[model samples]
Target: MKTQVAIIGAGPSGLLLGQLLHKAGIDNVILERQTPDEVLGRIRAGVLEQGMVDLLREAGVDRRMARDGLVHEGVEIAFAGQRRRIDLKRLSGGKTVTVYGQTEVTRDLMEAREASGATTVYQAAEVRLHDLQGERPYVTFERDGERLRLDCDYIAGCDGFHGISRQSIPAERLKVFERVYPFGWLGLLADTPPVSHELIYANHPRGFALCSQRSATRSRYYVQVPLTEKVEDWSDERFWTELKARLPAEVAEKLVTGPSLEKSIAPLRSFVVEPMQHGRLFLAGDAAHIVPPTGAKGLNLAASDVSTLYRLLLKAYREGRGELLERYSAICLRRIWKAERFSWWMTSVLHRFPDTDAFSQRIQQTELEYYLGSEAGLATIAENYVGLPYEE
Candidate 1:
């Protein structure tokens, strides 16, 4: 059967795109190389920019999100022995970020896709793209020992950084920009209440730590560590102690410790690939770029990419403005760079650098105060935190 679009990967980006296009009466199918359980098992950042919240509602997948999600109006930046709160809602003209786990968002999208009778192939093995440089690109994958070919007018490469979608592009056509940080985030998830009602980013002489949450009862925490650090080396008690030390004394006093449900280390980095689209294949989300989790822009950026692609595709199909397709990469990159800068800046401000010079240390200290000391600067953080408005 021929579809209008063949989407790769079944993460929130692909699933959300399929749902949005479905609501607009567009026909599409999603191909995933993972099982439903495997897809939902991965834990990721829960903080969602306002744009993503709006997109979720637009797709009509907000029932569970609205009911269970935490609406955060502000976040705290801990440095210089002070915890300054940036009132995101007040500063960004009432924009608010919701604390809904990425896993839950994926689950909600999966359910909605199933309810709408949309097709998604899980455990798709050896998926490959053909004729991506032509008008009619098709996808081939093996599932359940059966090889199937999906013919479509366009293909969405929603697959992540390691996925095959991006590899199909000619190496010469893509220019990559990336920065690998010296440290990684050692994160732990536990069934304990968060020390703070809102997210807290702590900058200590020792290191950086973040106190985040999924629900009232489930807490997620992370601390900066050398890239060489191993998860196996950090016991539950040691992680709790290090996390407490990095946070403000007041915030640490209220911290709760528990057995970690999961613990792992993820290296921080900034990555982006040029020209998100080639021919009919458009790259969205992690496939196109990635950001450190500092400002929680990873998933939100994906949502924005999906929004742009969805709108452009709609105009092309319904209004016959096929030329608009060429604008996807240019427009998406405009916003992508802003997000990349924010995430990188956030990482620098809230993390300790081993090789930071004396002058650099003084500059970082002054920079935090300079930003927090001014209303305009604080508002900048607020607006960026909630995310920039979607461009039509």
Candidate 2:
């Protein structure tokens, strides 16, 4: 199969890329590693910035998202018996975060693709991207246990951190930057309704707790634990007890004592691959960089890259322009690093310090308070969270 664009990985970046390319009247083939059920059943990021929401709606994919997504005007940061809410609307001129899971968005996109008669190879087997530096790039993979190949003008790498696309890029051109945290998050999906209306970030002596809601009937929560801690060590009663201790006293009454349907440990790490392109193969999303789950920038960053690349390809195909393609990597890098920095900042502040002394702790708190009190400081965060302006 030959197409104008070959999108690797069917996650947000790749799938969304296919949709945009189709909208532009460009042909694209999307190769995915997982089935629709497997991919859409997984739970991941929930915060969607206004900029991304606009893009999705403009692309004609936000209809279901708008119906089910929860819109938040602000987030509450509570620590040491003090509560502070940073109003996102005031800080960013009405831009807010939409509480919707990545999987939900994926489901909506996949269904739209099918209904629109788009071609997608799900559960592709033995997939390999070749001729990345050549004029005609290609990806080799198996679909339904049958070997297949796709020759494309350009390749979009959205296969995530461990995807094979990174291997296609030579070692010399790869500039890898990474930070591995000593801890991980024990993420949980509770069956009960959310106790609080606003998302809460709680820093406690015991650990860090995130009180988040996925919908009216479900809550997603997290607890910072040592990386070495195993799931076997945590029982239902102990887990809820720990959750209760970290939440606000008022949230205790609404705590759901039932067992969690999903419980898993997520390793905390920050990583980035510079430039995000190697020849004709352009990496986007987790395939290019990864940040800890704290800031919820992972999904948004992926959407940004996909949107940018789609525009660049459009110009290249329709207007015979090469500058957009030439500067794609450089332009994407600017926003990539910004998101990485924000995610790192939030992770560093919310998680406990391993080597820091009391003085360092005071400095951390001082900066937090400074940012909390100053409009200028909060605006910086608000702008980044709301999203940087993307012409693409």
Candidate 3:
């Protein structure tokens, strides 16, 4: 098989790339390693940055999101049993956020791609990309146990962190950076409605908790848990009780009783592999970096990366030059590190450290207090939450 470009993985980034390229008359094939159900049904992130929502609108996939997404003007930050609101729209022009899950996005994009006749090999495609040393690169994959090859001018590595792209680069060319927290979040998908209209990020002596909604009738929440806490360690009643303890004393009663239909331990970490480009292969999204969930930046960042790369690829193709290709790494890392810093700073401030020394805990409290008290700090939070203008 031959195409103008070859894409790996059919997650949001890869699938979106195919949509953009196909619309521009660039032929490409998407290779997904998972069954459709796992790709569409496994729920993850729900928050969408204003910029991401705009991109979807531009891409012609916002009909459902515009009708159903909950537009949140701001989020609340609670500390010492008190709450403060960060009004993003007031502080950052007209920028705002929406409560829309990653699963919902996949469903929409997958539907759009299918409607447009985007080719995809689900569950049984052998996929590989090679020839970085020459003019034409190629991707090889298998279907029904039959090996196949796709020769292409460029390859997009949207396969994610566990995929082959990040590791494909030689070790010396790589610079790895990471910060792993002492605790992980115990996330639950409950059948109850949210206690608050907007997301509530609470910091307590016990740890951090986040209350966000997945849908009108279903709420999603997370409480900090020990790194070693097992899923079986907590019953439905116990989970509800602990959640109540983390909520404000007044709102605690409104949380209601709901079973944890879904429960998982999400470890906290920030990672970015340097030089997002390797020859004809360009890495975007989780294939390039990861941020803690505190900033709600995962799926949004992936969308942003693809949004930027799509433009760059268009320019490169039009001019018949790889100038944009050469600068892709530097350009993406600017946003990646900026996001990493913001997420790390937020994660450090909100989560409790089991081994935190007296001095460290005091520092954490001081920072949170300063953020709530100082106009400058609040403005900083507002800007990050709404997303800065695209830096291209």
Candidate 3 lDDT, tens digit per residue, 291-358?
A: 99999888888987898888888888877766867878777788878888889889989888777799
Q: Compared with the true structure, what per-residue lDDT tens digits does model 2 show for residues 32-77?
A: 8888888877888888988789879867898889899999988888
The list of candidate 1 runs beyond 4 A from truth reads none
Task: Give the clash count for each candidate.
Answer: 0, 1, 4
Q: lDDT of each prediction vs. the true structure?
A: 0.92, 0.85, 0.85
Q: Give the TM-score of each candidate.
A: 0.98, 0.96, 0.97
Question: Residue 85 in candidate 3 has what lDDT?
Answer: 90
lDDT of 1 by residue, 300-333 (tens): 9999999999999999999999899999999999
Instruction: Enumerate residue pairs that collide in model 3.
Output: 126-141, 126-142, 127-141, 128-140
Provide the lowest-lDDT 10-residue window in model 1. 132-141
Q: What is the RMSD, in Å, between candidate 3 and the native fold over all Cα? A: 1.3
What residue pairs clash in candidate 2, if any at all? 125-142
Candidate 1's C-alpha lDDT?
A: 0.92
